Design a protein around this motif. Structure first.
Motif, PDB file in Angstrom:
ATOM      1  N   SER A   1      45.425  52.408  51.477  1.00 27.95           N
ATOM      2  CA  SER A   1      44.103  53.021  51.489  1.00 27.95           C
ATOM      3  C   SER A   1      43.015  51.979  51.263  1.00 27.95           C
ATOM      4  O   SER A   1      42.789  51.109  52.104  1.00 27.95           O
ATOM      5  CB  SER A   1      44.011  54.118  50.426  1.00 27.95           C
ATOM      6  N   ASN A   2      42.341  52.072  50.121  1.00 24.70           N
ATOM      7  CA  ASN A   2      41.272  51.154  49.761  1.00 24.70           C
ATOM      8  C   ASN A   2      41.607  50.499  48.427  1.00 24.70           C
ATOM      9  O   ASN A   2      42.644  50.770  47.817  1.00 24.70           O
ATOM     10  CB  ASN A   2      39.920  51.876  49.704  1.00 24.70           C
ATOM     11  N   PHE A   3      40.717  49.625  47.974  1.00 22.28           N
ATOM     12  CA  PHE A   3      40.937  48.866  46.755  1.00 22.28           C
ATOM     13  C   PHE A   3      40.344  49.625  45.570  1.00 22.28           C
ATOM     14  O   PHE A   3      40.034  50.815  45.657  1.00 22.28           O
ATOM     15  CB  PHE A   3      40.337  47.470  46.880  1.00 22.28           C
ATOM     16  N   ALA A   4      40.189  48.938  44.438  1.00 22.20           N
ATOM     17  CA  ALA A   4      39.628  49.546  43.241  1.00 22.20           C
ATOM     18  C   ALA A   4      38.140  49.246  43.157  1.00 22.20           C
ATOM     19  O   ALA A   4      37.762  48.071  43.040  1.00 22.20           O
ATOM     20  CB  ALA A   4      40.342  49.029  41.999  1.00 22.20           C
ATOM     21  N   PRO A   5      37.271  50.250  43.206  1.00 26.07           N
ATOM     22  CA  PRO A   5      35.834  49.989  43.088  1.00 26.07           C
ATOM     23  C   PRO A   5      35.466  49.451  41.717  1.00 26.07           C
ATOM     24  O   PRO A   5      36.114  49.747  40.711  1.00 26.07           O
ATOM     25  CB  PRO A   5      35.203  51.364  43.331  1.00 26.07           C
ATOM     26  N   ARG A   6      34.402  48.659  41.692  1.00 27.00           N
ATOM     27  CA  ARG A   6      33.972  47.964  40.482  1.00 27.00           C
ATOM     28  C   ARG A   6      33.524  48.957  39.416  1.00 27.00           C
ATOM     29  O   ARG A   6      32.728  49.853  39.718  1.00 27.00           O
ATOM     30  CB  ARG A   6      32.841  47.002  40.825  1.00 27.00           C
ATOM     31  N   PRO A   7      33.995  48.840  38.171  1.00 34.70           N
ATOM     32  CA  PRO A   7      33.631  49.828  37.150  1.00 34.70           C
ATOM     33  C   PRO A   7      32.266  49.573  36.537  1.00 34.70           C
ATOM     34  O   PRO A   7      31.551  50.517  36.188  1.00 34.70           O
ATOM     35  CB  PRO A   7      34.743  49.683  36.104  1.00 34.70           C
ATOM     36  N   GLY A   8      31.895  48.307  36.390  1.00 33.49           N
ATOM     37  CA  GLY A   8      30.611  47.984  35.806  1.00 33.49           C
ATOM     38  C   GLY A   8      30.390  46.501  35.618  1.00 33.49           C
ATOM     39  O   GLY A   8      31.210  45.683  36.039  1.00 33.49           O
ATOM     40  N   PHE A   9      29.272  46.140  34.995  1.00 33.35           N
ATOM     41  CA  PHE A   9      28.973  44.739  34.735  1.00 33.35           C
ATOM     42  C   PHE A   9      29.131  44.480  33.244  1.00 33.35           C
ATOM     43  O   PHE A   9      28.300  44.926  32.447  1.00 33.35           O
ATOM     44  CB  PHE A   9      27.553  44.387  35.187  1.00 33.35           C
ATOM     45  N   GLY A  10      30.176  43.760  32.854  1.00 30.66           N
ATOM     46  CA  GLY A  10      30.461  43.577  31.445  1.00 30.66           C
ATOM     47  C   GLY A  10      29.410  42.763  30.722  1.00 30.66           C
ATOM     48  O   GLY A  10      28.602  42.083  31.358  1.00 30.66           O
ATOM     49  N   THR A  11      29.401  42.827  29.393  1.00 31.81           N
ATOM     50  CA  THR A  11      28.443  42.088  28.584  1.00 31.81           C
ATOM     51  C   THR A  11      29.148  41.500  27.373  1.00 31.81           C
ATOM     52  O   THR A  11      29.613  42.241  26.503  1.00 31.81           O
ATOM     53  CB  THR A  11      27.288  42.981  28.131  1.00 31.81           C
ATOM     54  N   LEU A  12      29.219  40.178  27.321  1.00 32.86           N
ATOM     55  CA  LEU A  12      29.835  39.457  26.211  1.00 32.86           C
ATOM     56  C   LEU A  12      29.299  38.031  26.248  1.00 32.86           C
ATOM     57  O   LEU A  12      28.689  37.609  27.235  1.00 32.86           O
ATOM     58  CB  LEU A  12      31.362  39.511  26.292  1.00 32.86           C
ATOM     59  N   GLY A  13      29.501  37.296  25.167  1.00 32.88           N
ATOM     60  CA  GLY A  13      29.117  35.904  25.140  1.00 32.88           C
ATOM     61  C   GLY A  13      27.612  35.703  25.138  1.00 32.88           C
ATOM     62  O   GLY A  13      26.822  36.622  24.924  1.00 32.88           O
ATOM     63  N   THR A  14      27.224  34.460  25.404  1.00 31.95           N
ATOM     64  CA  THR A  14      25.833  34.023  25.329  1.00 31.95           C
ATOM     65  C   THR A  14      25.275  33.948  26.743  1.00 31.95           C
ATOM     66  O   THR A  14      25.642  33.058  27.513  1.00 31.95           O
ATOM     67  CB  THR A  14      25.732  32.682  24.635  1.00 31.95           C
ATOM     68  N   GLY A 713      33.140  15.316  39.041  1.00 34.47           N
ATOM     69  CA  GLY A 713      32.725  16.064  40.209  1.00 34.47           C
ATOM     70  C   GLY A 713      32.156  17.422  39.836  1.00 34.47           C
ATOM     71  O   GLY A 713      31.650  17.628  38.735  1.00 34.47           O
ATOM     72  N   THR A 714      32.241  18.357  40.774  1.00 38.92           N
ATOM     73  CA  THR A 714      31.761  19.716  40.568  1.00 38.92           C
ATOM     74  C   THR A 714      32.956  20.640  40.365  1.00 38.92           C
ATOM     75  O   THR A 714      33.910  20.611  41.150  1.00 38.92           O
ATOM     76  CB  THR A 714      30.891  20.177  41.741  1.00 38.92           C
ATOM     77  N   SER A 715      32.917  21.436  39.302  1.00 39.50           N
ATOM     78  CA  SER A 715      34.031  22.321  38.996  1.00 39.50           C
ATOM     79  C   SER A 715      34.088  23.457  40.004  1.00 39.50           C
ATOM     80  O   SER A 715      33.076  24.104  40.276  1.00 39.50           O
ATOM     81  CB  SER A 715      33.888  22.874  37.583  1.00 39.50           C
ATOM     82  N   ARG A 716      35.268  23.706  40.545  1.00 34.80           N
ATOM     83  CA  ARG A 716      35.428  24.762  41.531  1.00 34.80           C
ATOM     84  C   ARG A 716      35.882  26.037  40.834  1.00 34.80           C
ATOM     85  O   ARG A 716      37.026  26.118  40.375  1.00 34.80           O
ATOM     86  CB  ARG A 716      36.433  24.344  42.603  1.00 34.80           C
ATOM     87  N   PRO A 717      35.024  27.046  40.731  1.00 33.63           N
ATOM     88  CA  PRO A 717      35.411  28.271  40.029  1.00 33.63           C
ATOM     89  C   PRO A 717      36.515  29.022  40.752  1.00 33.63           C
ATOM     90  O   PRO A 717      36.597  29.029  41.981  1.00 33.63           O
ATOM     91  CB  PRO A 717      34.112  29.085  40.002  1.00 33.63           C
ATOM     92  N   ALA A 718      37.365  29.673  39.965  1.00 31.29           N
ATOM     93  CA  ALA A 718      38.436  30.500  40.495  1.00 31.29           C
ATOM     94  C   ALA A 718      37.914  31.890  40.818  1.00 31.29           C
ATOM     95  O   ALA A 718      37.053  32.418  40.114  1.00 31.29           O
ATOM     96  CB  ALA A 718      39.579  30.593  39.490  1.00 31.29           C
ATOM     97  N   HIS A 719      38.448  32.486  41.876  1.00 29.34           N
ATOM     98  CA  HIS A 719      37.963  33.757  42.413  1.00 29.34           C
ATOM     99  C   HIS A 719      39.052  34.811  42.215  1.00 29.34           C
ATOM    100  O   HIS A 719      39.881  35.038  43.094  1.00 29.34           O
ATOM    101  CB  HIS A 719      37.580  33.577  43.885  1.00 29.34           C
ATOM    102  N   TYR A 720      39.045  35.461  41.051  1.00 30.92           N
ATOM    103  CA  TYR A 720      40.078  36.441  40.713  1.00 30.92           C
ATOM    104  C   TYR A 720      39.714  37.798  41.311  1.00 30.92           C
ATOM    105  O   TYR A 720      39.239  38.712  40.639  1.00 30.92           O
ATOM    106  CB  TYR A 720      40.263  36.545  39.206  1.00 30.92           C
ATOM    107  N   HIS A 721      39.971  37.929  42.606  1.00 29.05           N
ATOM    108  CA  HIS A 721      39.652  39.170  43.297  1.00 29.05           C
ATOM    109  C   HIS A 721      40.592  40.276  42.847  1.00 29.05           C
ATOM    110  O   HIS A 721      41.655  40.461  43.440  1.00 29.05           O
ATOM    111  CB  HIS A 721      39.755  38.973  44.809  1.00 29.05           C
ATOM    112  N   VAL A 722      40.205  41.038  41.825  1.00 30.95           N
ATOM    113  CA  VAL A 722      41.080  42.074  41.287  1.00 30.95           C
ATOM    114  C   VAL A 722      41.149  43.218  42.285  1.00 30.95           C
ATOM    115  O   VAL A 722      40.262  44.076  42.330  1.00 30.95           O
ATOM    116  CB  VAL A 722      40.594  42.576  39.916  1.00 30.95           C
TER     117      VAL A 722
END
Ligand code: MG
Length: 791
Positions: A1-14, A713-722
């Motif tokens: 079918s389809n994937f899991a829709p995003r639940p929200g925008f979390g808030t933690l840290g600075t 160099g420039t750090s390459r961020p990881a893309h954890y496509h849940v």
RNA sequence: UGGAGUGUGACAAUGGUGUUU
RNA sequence: CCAUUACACUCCA
């Protein structure tokens, strides 16, 4: 079918501000038409055939096209702004190089517009934007693969002896919360430098040729460099041709004061044309494809690994010189972009507290910036060592220095928190590199003939700098059909004994002989959400391609900690993403349908290890393409859901696929590079930086975590496509868990970039190359299967 | 193969290649 | 331009 829709925008840290390379590109506002291409005679010849369409457009722009400038895909498509007055016309044009080509343009179908605007997944808008960008590329710059570039966007640095820098961009068009974002990222590749041939050759060989007689080595170097270089004749100005170079002659010019300069095979062997050097010029179109020495390698690496400030400035310069506005294609097409880097306000997560053994002058350690030393501390579990032998596989290291290093390692393991019994069972004897099988069963069986059944626990094996299949044979026959644990080191390390080396190999040994070394305070005090209430087995997976395409799976094995990851490796058919070996059902005559694979014989291991079945699975897939998520999410989940209903019926815990991808180009830069927003050392965002705002897939669940420090160099961020989840994980929950988990890495005292569950799978699927001899892999002896044999 | 990070193309093989000098 | 049958750098206590 389809994937899991995003639940929200979390808030933690600075919370802070990070700017990325995602130039907003508004979709156009004019109707677009699709017209097919049909050309006779039919040959592929894509580069030449594009010239046919170019000449057709140039000749018939006013006659039939109507002064509108079409967009040409190349292979099989063509797009036009608005609608052309005609519906089907045929014309014939010829390539200027002779067989004429006849082309017919007709209308078949039309997906006009707004096929992605309603989405914000029909990728028609993305495809049209990509076609327009590629047409701009083929019209203005010189494409080499997919990362096309051309000079004058930056001063072309001289790599050396006639090479040039020619930095350039590697764009892609990707839908995003901004809307059809552009993805300019810069990649560098050396090109050949136009120059007068005299000084070009003089700097290529390092010396002038006029004042020295010709030599065989100079001729060899010149022919190797110049085999395939295009040359333009300047002897006659009126007539110029693209003369290809076939080779270098072996005859003097006497057959222009340079008498000793040999000519070249101008054209080909059939057309024997010989002409002097100084009456020609070098063409810049071609690219250097031969080897580069380790002077030009360093000179080029100095450019491509610039600090992130120098990279964001270059990325911003690329578009400000690309000048997408006031460009004919955009003006006639309606495409508009921005010229400033995207700004987002993502937040930095805090580093987690780590607790060590009750001994030692400090039992706690929080990673300061993202890396922490094990000084003044001791590991949680120290596994005692009673029997172990050292075999030397070199002649440079003698019986004195080998034993000295082996004892220093033992002292370092003792002070790091585990018992290491000195005085080995069988002393070292410096076995020959050739008699590998004989030495490696002699050492094993000397104990059995001496210590009466006390099997070796750690067979140390120093090996020389250059393996030459020695590593393969050693750590193949050291675990297949002969159960053992080896900790081979290098000769160049034994002489250079360093505290860091010893205290980082000791950590690997301790985690390599059945124990664990560090653990988060939260996971042991039962405070991590969704991980510490019911048993969670955090899997991993990987598929590496080279000949079977072997694949690996690694699981978790304990409740309070998630540090131990024992797993299995296998082989299947060649070069396919999904793995068919997860659940296999061969036929047994006496029994029924025996069920095997990895997600059965790896859950049984978890049951044996902890005493209870796992009630939550987090399959944590890694290394998959960006467009075939669907097939992987289908098969790798159906295999689990069908395997778990085989060991015991009516048992299917909620899985949670999280595909990890690191081979992407979407960098992140700190907003203010003149303060302590960066790591204040080799500038980069602070270790831990979740960007789920304004740069993601709008109707999906993913984040650009950057949990690793940037050494250079420039750090390459990881893309954890849940992709898929059934735990109803909180969006802050996944981000906190994944950042907090990449601190429990065995071999390291740091935080990995891609997290251990999806990183151990990359090592267990890489080690099996040496085991390899659809052909089944040799069995892994039960002696080392529960014990991590790779990390 | 102490380990993390990010850098690059087969650092390399053989044969062949139409509008002329 | 066609056909044939994998390496380095940086950093660590
Ligand atoms: Mg991998």
């Amino acid at each position: 079918s389809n994937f899991a829709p995003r639940p929200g925008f979390g808030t933690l840290g600075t919370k802070c501000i990070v700017k990325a390379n995602h130039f907003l590109a508004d979709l156009p506002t004019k109707d677009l038409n699709q017209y097919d291409v049909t050309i006779t005679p039919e040959v592929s010849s894509k580069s030449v055939n594009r010239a046919i369409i170019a000449e057709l457009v140039r000749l018939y722009k006013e006659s039939d096209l109507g002064r509108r400038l079409p967009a040409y895909d190349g292979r099989k498509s063509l797009y036009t702004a608005g609608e052309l007055p005609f519906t089907w016309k045929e014309f014939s044009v010829k390539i200027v190089d002779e067989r004429s080509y006849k082309v017919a343009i007709k209308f078949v179908a039309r997906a006009n517009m707004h096929h992605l605007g309603e989405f914000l997944c029909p990728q028609e808008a993305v495809q049209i934007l990509d076609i327009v960008l590629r047409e701009l590329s083929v019209k203005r710059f010189c494409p080499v693969g997919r990362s096309f570039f051309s000079p004058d966007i930056k001063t072309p640095q001289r790599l050396g002896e006639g090479l040039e820098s020619w930095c350039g961009f590697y764009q892609s068009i990707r839908p995003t919360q901004m809307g059809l974002s552009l993805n300019i990222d810069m990649a560098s590749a050396a090109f050949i430098e136009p120059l007068p041939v005299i000084e070009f050759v003089a700097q290529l060989l390092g010396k002038d040729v006029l004042s020295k007689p010709l030599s065989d080595s100079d001729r060899v170097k010149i022919k190797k460099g110049l085999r395939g270089v295009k040359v333009e004749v300047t002897h006659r100005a009126n007539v110029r041709r693209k003369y290809r170079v076939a080779g270098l002659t072996t005859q003097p010019t006497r057959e222009i004061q340079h008498t000793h300069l040999p000519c070249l095979q101008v054209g080909n062997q059939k057309k024997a044309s010989y002409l002097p050097m100084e009456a020609c010029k070098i063409v810049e179109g071609q690219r250097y494809t031969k080897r580069l020495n380790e002077k030009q390698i360093t000179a080029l690496l100095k450019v491509t690994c610039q600090r992130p400030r120098d990279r964001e400035n270059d990325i911003l310069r690329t578009v400000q010189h690309n000048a997408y506005d006031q460009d004919p294609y955009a003006k006639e097409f309606g495409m508009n972009i921005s010229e400033k880097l995207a700004s987002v306000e993502a937040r930095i997560l805090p580093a987690p507290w780590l607790k060590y053994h009750e001994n030692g002058k400090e039992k706690d350690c929080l990673p300061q910036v993202g890396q922490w030393n094990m000084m003044n501390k001791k590991m949680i579990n120290g596994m005692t060592v009673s029997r172990w032998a050292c075999v030397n596989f070199s002649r440079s290291v003698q019986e004195n220095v080998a034993r000295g290093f082996c004892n220093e390692l033992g002292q370092m393991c003792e002070v790091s928190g585990m018992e290491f019994n000195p005085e080995p069972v069988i002393p070292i004897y410096s076995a020959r590199p050739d008699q590998v099988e004989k030495a490696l069963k002699h050492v094993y069986h000397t104990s059995m003939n001496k210590t009466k059944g006390k099997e070796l626990e750690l067979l140390l094996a120093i090996l020389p700098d250059n393996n030459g299949s020695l590593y393969g044979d050693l750590k193949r026959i050291c675990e297949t059909e002969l159960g053992l644990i080896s900790q081979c080191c290098l000769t160049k390390h034994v002489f250079k004994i360093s505290k860091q080396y010893l205290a980082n190999v000791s950590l690997k040994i301790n985690v390599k002989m059945g124990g664990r070394n560090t653990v988060l305070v939260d996971a042991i005090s039962c405070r991590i959400p969704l991980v510490s209430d019911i048993p969670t087995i955090i899997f991993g997976a990987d598929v590496t391609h080279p000949s079977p395409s072997i694949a690996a799976v690694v699981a978790s094995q304990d409740w309070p900690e998630v540090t131990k990851y024992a797993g299995l490796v296998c082989a299947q058919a060649h070069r396919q993403e999904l793995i068919q070996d997860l659940y296999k059902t061969w036929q047994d005559p006496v029994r029924g349908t025996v069920s095997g694979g990895m997600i059965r014989d790896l859950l049984i291991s978890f049951r044996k290890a902890t005493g209870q079945k796992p009630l939550r699975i987090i399959f944590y897939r890694a290394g998959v393409s960006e467009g075939q998520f669907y097939q992987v999410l289908l098969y790798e989940l159906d295999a689990i859901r069908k395997a778990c209903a085989s060991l015991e019926p009516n048992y299917q815990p909620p899985v949670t696929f999280i595909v990890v991808q690191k081979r992407h180009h979407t960098r992140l830069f700190a907003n203010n590079h003149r303060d302590k927003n960066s790591t204040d050392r080799s500038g980069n965002i602070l270790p831990g930086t979740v960007v789920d705002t304004k740069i993601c897939h709008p109707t999906e669940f993913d984040f650009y975590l950057c949990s690793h420090a940037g050494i250079q160099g420039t750090s390459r961020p990881a893309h954890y496509h849940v992709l898929w989840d059934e735990n109803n994980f909180t969006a802050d929950g996944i981000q906190s868990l994944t950042n907090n988990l990449c601190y429990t890495y065995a071999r390291c005292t740091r935080s990995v970039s891609i997290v251990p569950p999806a990183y151990y799978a990359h090592l267990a699927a890489f080690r099996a190359r040496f085991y390899l001899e659809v052909k089944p892999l040799p069995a892994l002896k039960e002696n080392v299967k529960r014990v991590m044999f790779y990390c």
